[PDB]
Design a protein around this ligand. Structure first.
Ligand SMILES: [Ag+]
Ligand SMILES: [Ag+]
Ligand SMILES: [Ag+]
Length: 653
C-alpha cells in the first residue's frame, strides 16, 4: 500500500488494459494523449516536438486507432495531423483510460482495426451533500510546470464538477547538449452538471474548452493555436425491466480550431520554400451520438445499439504582399469548407457464459459511411478540383468472435479471437495526398476502404507472486492505405492501396520477490509486409523491452527502469503515412531511469524521477525528420530528451 510510479501498465483482462491516468508515470508524460500510451506495451509515438506525438499501435497509425473521450470523437484539422486527436486530450483530467487491442469490439464505432482507446470520466456518486477535490502540481527541467484541479460538489439529487489544467515546458535538450525546438503550452477547463433523480437515472451536461501551442522541430511550421470547444449530453437509465439492464444515450459536439504558422514560434527560414511570413487556419466540427441497450438474462448478455457521426473541415490562409512587406492574416478571409463526412451504424455484441470457466463473445456492426469533397479549387497558384462537390459512400460490415477459457488447476485464462474490420478512408487519406492511385483524378476519387482480418490470441495468469500476460496477433490487410513520398521540388505524396500481412505481440510479467521487492518486464513486437510490392511496411516500431525493479517499504517506494530498443532494419524508404516516411534503418539504444514516491498523509503524496539518467543521445525510428531551418540535415530525425528531472505532488481531499 506504499505509492509508486507507473512505468508500465499490464494487460488486465483479455486484449484489455485499464489504468488510472492520474498516477505518476516514469518517463514523464507531456500532458497529451500519446504520452500516456507509451506506458502500455504495443504503443509507440511519432515525435513532432516536445508534445503532441502521433500514437502508433502495433505499428498501426492514424484512424486505425479509435480514440474516444467520454464516448465522443475529437478530430483535429491540420492537413498533416500537426494536431492529432491526442493533442487535444489531457489524460490527467480523466479518471480511466481503457485500451482494447484488435478489432474485437463493435460498441464504440467504425473502423477500429488496430484498437480502440477510451478516456472516461465517471459520474460523481454523492450520498450526503458534500464535496471532493483532488489536484496535483508538477515541476521539472526546462521550465516544466503543470497544475491540475478536479473538484466536485453535490448530493443524492445532483452534482456540479470542474476539472482543469495548465501545463507548459520550454525547449528541452537532447543528450548531445543541443536545444531542441520543442516548447509547448496547454490549458483545459471543463464543467459537468449531473442530475440523478433516482439511482436508476443519471443525466449529465458537459462543456469545456482548451487551448495550447507547440513548437515542432519536426515540421516547417508550428502550432500557435489548438482551440477546442466541447458540448456533451449523456443519459443512463438502469433496471428498466427484468431483462433490460441499462439504456444509455449520448450526444457530443467537438470543435477544433488550429493555427499553423512560421513566424509566431520561429523565424521564417529564408533558405526554404517559405521565406515570407505565412499562417494557415483550419477547423474541424464533429457532431455525433450513441444509443445502446444492454440486455441480461440466463447465461447471456446482449448489447444492441446504433450510432451516428458527422464532421466538417474548413481552412483559410494568409497572404503576403511580396512587392511590399504587407501581411494579411488568415482571419481576414472567409473559411473554405473542403470536406464533410457522415457515418451511421448499427451494432450488437452477444456474450454466452457457458458453464463458469467458459465465455464466448460475438459482435457485429454495419456502417454506412459517406464523404463529400467541397473543395472548389486546389493548391502552385490555384487550379481546378476535378471532384468538386462529388459524393461517395459505402456500406461496411465488421465483426468478431472470441472464445475465453479458464483453466481449473491454476488461475489461467486462454483466449483466441477472429475479427474483421472495414474502415472508410479518413480526412487525411482522401484530401491530404497530392496524388491518388495511378490513373486516378485524385485520391478522393479512388482510395478504397481498408479491410483487416486478424487472429488475436493470448493468456492471463493471476497468481499471488507472479502475474503474467501475453497477446499475439496475425492478420491480413486488404487495400492498406499507403503513402509514398516522391520528393523531386518539395515533397509530393501519393496515396495507394496495397495488400499487407501483419503479425506481432506483446507480453509482460510482474513478480513479487518479497514483501518489499517487486520486479516486472514487458516486450512489444510488431511486424509488417507490403504484399503488393514485396517489401516491408514503413513506419514500424522496432522490438522493445522494459525492465522495472521496485522496492516498497511502509510509506515510500524507489524504483529503477531500463528501456531497451532493438534497431529497425525492416524499412520502406520514402513510404509511410500522412505524417512521416521511412528513410534510414534506426539504431538500437538503451535508456535508464530512477523514481521514488512517498505518502506524507492520506491526502498528500510526493513523486520524483530522473528520466534518461545517463543523458543518452538517441532518437526513435518513428520520429519525424528535423527541419532544415533548424539545425537538422537530411532525414536526421528529432532526438528524444536528454536527462530530465521531475517532481510532483498529489492532493486528494
Ligand atoms: Ag501544419
Ligand atoms: Ag508554411
Ligand atoms: Ag508562402
Amino acid at each position: 500500500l506504499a505509492p509508486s510510479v507507473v512505468t508500465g501498465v499490464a494487460q488486465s483482462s483479455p486484449l484489455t488494459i485499464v489504468t488510472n491516468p492520474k498516477e505518476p508515470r516514469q518517463p514523464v508524460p507531456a500532458s497529451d494523449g500519446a504520452d500516456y500510451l507509451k506506458t502500455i506495451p504495443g504503443f509507440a509515438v511519432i515525435r513532432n516536438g516536445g508534445s503532441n506525438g502521433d500514437p502508433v499501435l502495433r505499428g498501426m497509425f492514424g484512424s486505425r486507432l479509435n480514440i474516444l473521450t467520454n464516448g465522443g470523437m475529437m478530430l483535429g484539422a491540420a492537413p498533416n495531423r500537426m494536431d492529432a486527436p491526442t493533442s487535444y486530450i489531457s489524460p490527467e483530467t480523466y479518471d480511466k483510460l481503457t485500451v482494447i487491442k484488435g478489432p474485437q469490439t463493435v460498441l464504440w464505432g467504425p473502423g477500429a482495426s488496430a484498437g480502440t482507446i477510451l478516456f472516461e470520466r465517471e459520474p460523481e456518486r454523492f450520498g450526503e451533500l458534500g464535496s471532493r477535490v483532488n489536484a496535483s502540481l508538477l515541476a521539472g527541467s526546462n521550465g516544466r510546470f503543470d497544475k491540475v484541479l478536479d473538484a466536485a460538489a453535490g448530493n443524492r439529487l445532483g452534482y456540479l464538477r470542474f476539472t482543469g489544467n495548465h501545463a507548459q515546458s520550454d525547449d528541452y535538450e537532447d543528450g548531445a547538449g543541443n536545444t531542441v525546438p520543442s516548447r509547448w503550452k496547454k490549458w483545459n477547463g471543463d464543467v459537468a452538471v449531473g442530475w440523478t433523480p433516482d439511482e436508476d437515472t443519471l443525466i449529465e451536461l458537459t462543456a469545456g474548452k482548451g487551448d495550447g501551442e507547440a513548437r515542432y522541430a519536426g515540421r516547417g511550421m508550428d502550432g500557435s493555436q489548438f482551440k477546442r470547444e466541447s458540448l456533451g449530453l449523456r443519459f443512463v437509465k438502469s433496471n428498466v425491466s427484468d431483462v433490460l439492464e441499462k439504456v444509455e444515450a449520448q450526444v457530443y459536439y467537438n470543435y477544433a480550431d488550429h493555427i499553423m504558422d512560421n513566424f509566431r514560434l520561429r523565424t521564417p527560414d529564408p533558405s526554404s520554400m517559405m521565406p515570407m511570413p505565412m499562417a494557415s487556419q483550419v477547423d474541424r466540427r464533429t457532431l455525433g451520438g450513441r444509443l445502446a441497450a444492454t440486455w441480461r438474462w440466463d447465461d447471456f448478455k446482449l448489447v444492441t445499439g446504433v450510432d451516428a457521426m458527422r464532421n466538417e473541415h474548413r481552412a483559410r490562409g494568409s497572404k503576403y504582399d511580396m512587392m511590399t512587406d504587407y501581411y494579411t492574416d488568415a482571419d481576414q478571409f472567409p473559411w473554405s469548407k473542403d470536406a464533410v463526412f457522415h457515418n451511421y451504424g448499427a451494432f450488437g455484441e452477444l456474450t454466452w457464459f457457458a458453464a463458469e470457466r467458459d465465455r464466448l463473445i460475438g459482435g457485429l456492426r454495419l456502417d454506412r459511411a459517406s464523404v463529400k469533397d467541397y473543395r472548389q479549387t486546389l493548391k502552385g497558384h490555384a487550379m481546378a478540383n476535378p471532384t468538386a462537390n462529388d459524393t461517395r459512400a459505402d456500406t461496411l460490415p465488421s465483426g468478431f468472435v472470441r472464445y475465453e477459457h479458464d483453466l481449473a488447476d491454476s488461475p489461467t485464462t486462454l483466449y483466441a479471437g477472429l475479427g474483421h474490420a472495414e474502415r472508410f478512408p479518413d480526412y487525411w487519406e482522401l484530401f491530404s495526398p497530392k496524388r491518388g492511385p495511378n490513373g486516378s483524378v485524385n485520391a478522393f476519387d479512388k482510395i478504397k476502404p481498408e479491410k483487416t482480418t486478424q487472429l488475436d490470441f493470448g493468456l492471463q495468469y493471476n497468481g499471488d507472486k507472479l502475474q503474467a500476460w501475453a497477446s499475439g496477433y496475425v492478420g491480413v490487410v486488404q487495400d492498406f492505405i499507403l503513402f509514398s513520398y516522391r520528393e523531386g521540388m518539395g515533397s509530393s505524396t501519393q496515396a495507394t492501396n496495397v495488400d499487407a500481412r501483419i503479425m506481432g505481440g506483446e507480453l509482460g510479467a510482474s513478480y513479487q520477490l518479497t514483501g518489499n521487492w517487486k520486479t516486472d518486464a514487458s516486450l512489444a513486437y510488431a511486424w509488417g509486409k507490403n504484399s503488393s510490392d514485396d517489401r516491408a511496411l514503413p513506419q514500424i516500431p522496432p522490438l522493445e523491452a522494459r525492465f522495472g525493479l521496485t522496492y516498497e517499504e511502509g510509506d515510500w517506494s524507489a524504483g529503477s527502469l531500463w528501456r531497451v530498443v532493438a534497431p529497425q532494419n525492416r524499412i520502406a524508404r520514402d513510404q509511410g503515412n500522412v505524417v512521416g516516411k521511412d528513410f534510414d534503418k534506426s539504431a538500437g539504444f538503451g535508456v535508464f531511469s530512477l523514481n521514488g514516491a512517498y505518502r506524507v498523509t492520506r491526502n498528500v503524496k510526493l513523486s520524483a524521477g530522473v528520466d534518461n539518467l545517463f543523458d543518452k543521445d538517441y532518437t526513435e525510428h518513428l520520429n519525424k525528420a528535423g527541419d532544415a531551418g533548424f539545425g537538422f540535415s537530411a532525414n536526421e530525425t528529432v532526438p528524444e530528451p536528454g536527462r530530465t528531472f521531475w517532481t510532483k505532488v498529489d492532493f486528494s481531499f
